[PDB]
Structures are given as structure tokens and as C-alpha cells.
From Swiss-Prot, chains A, B:
Description of how the protein assembles with itself and partners: Heteromer of multiple flagellin subunits including FlaA, FlaB, FlaC, FlaD and FlaE.
Domain of life: Bacteria
Gene responsible for this protein: flaD
Family (UniProt): Belongs to the bacterial flagellin family.
Protein name: Flagellin D
Function: Flagellin is the subunit protein which polymerizes to form the filaments of bacterial flagella. FlaD is not essential for flagellar synthesis and motility.
Origin species: Vibrio cholerae serotype O1 (strain ATCC 39315 / El Tor Inaba N16961)
Misc remark: V.cholerae is able to differentially regulate the flagellins within the flagellum maybe to produce flagella which are particularly suited for motility within a given environment.
Cellular localization per UniProt: Secreted; Bacterial flagellum
Length: 53, 53
């Protein structure tokens, strides 16, 4: 049906809009810094070995 | 991979450039003095037998 209060299409498009935005923010941080690991969230194990190296 | 943070090719060229400079400095010192044993590092037992001769 056609309803005004609920817009499922708007919510879904917004969710995928933020998904793209976060991917763009992490990719832009990687480019400016030149490092693909910046915090433990990128790679926990990789961060530790990279700090030991 | 293409990265800016690490330049292993430049590191290798530096390593072989300092080796060439060290061997060039040793040869220059050898020519000016006219001795191939200007120190103990050049030849230990050669230094002692040459000193005793």
C-alpha cells in the first residue's frame, strides 16, 4: 500500500548511504596516512606484529 | 603493491651505495699511503709479520 508515516525505502537507502560513507572515510584515511592499519579495529593481529616489526 | 611509506628499492640502493663508497675509500687510502696494510683490519697476521720484517 501507499502510506505516508512509514517509508521503508527511505530507511534502507539511508542505511546503504552510511555504509558507503564509512567505507569512503576509512579509505580516505588510509590514503592520507599511507598506512592501511591505523587503529586496532583495522587489524588486531596485524597491528601487533607491525608494531613489533 | 604501490606504496609511499616504504621504499625497499631505495633502501637496497643505499646499502650497495655505502658498500661502494667504503670500498672506494679503502682503495683511495691504499693508493695515497702506498701500503695495502694501513691497519690491523686489513690483515692481522700480515701486519705482524710485516712489522717484524
Amino acid at each position: 500500500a501507499v502510506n505516508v508515516n512509514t517509508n521503508v525505502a527511505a530507511m534502507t537507502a539511508q542505511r546503504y548511504l552510511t555504509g558507503a560513507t564509512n567505507a569512503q572515510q576509512t579509505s580516505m584515511e588510509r590514503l592520507s596516512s599511507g598506512f592501511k592499519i591505523n587503529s586496532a579495529k583495522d587489524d588486531a593481529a596485524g597491528l601487533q606484529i607491525s608494531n613489533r616489526l
